Amino acid sequence: SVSKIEPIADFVIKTKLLSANGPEKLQDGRKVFINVCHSPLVPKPEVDFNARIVFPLIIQNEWEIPIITSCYRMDHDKKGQECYVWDCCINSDCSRWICDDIQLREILVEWCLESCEIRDSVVLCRDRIAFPKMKKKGAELPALEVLNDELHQDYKA
Q1: How far apart are CA 114 and CA 1, in angstroms?
Q2: Which residues are within 8 A (CB) of 57 and not within 5 positions of it... i.e. 6 or more apart?
Q3: Which residues, in sequence order, are CB contacts of 12 under 8 Å at separation 6+?
Q4: For the chain, first and last CA: distance in Å?
Q5: Which among 26, 63, 114, 144 has the fewest CB atoms less than 10 Å away?
Q6: Contact 132, 14 (CB under 8 A)
């Protein structure tokens, strides 16, 4: 059974595509946008966010904010050049944690970049990075199709 997660727009990561080694063709050097968004349907860490507890767990690879990433979609800039867009959906509580702790927000941004890199075999720039003041890139964020074992425990069947 496939469930739908309708993400709530939050903020955008702007970057650059350095290389594409995946099953599909992408143009190197094109602008990349990542929509960091949220839903209460995304799993969340079992350990509540407390900086002194959690940052050592992150170093130990024992704690992470779960991310559900969409397939990429194409948009175009004003000169007609292709730009690639991904949605990275996290639990709504985790979206509030990254408001109050800038160190956690930086790590979450890195996790979102790695998530797109993993799912589509792309390499994204860590230097040519920006944070547009918009909530999302593009029109309505499309629904994420997920299996029931991917949902937050309290929202499973």
Answers
A1: 28
A2: 47, 63
A3: 33, 34, 35, 36, 131, 132, 134, 135, 136, 137
A4: 9
A5: 114
A6: yes
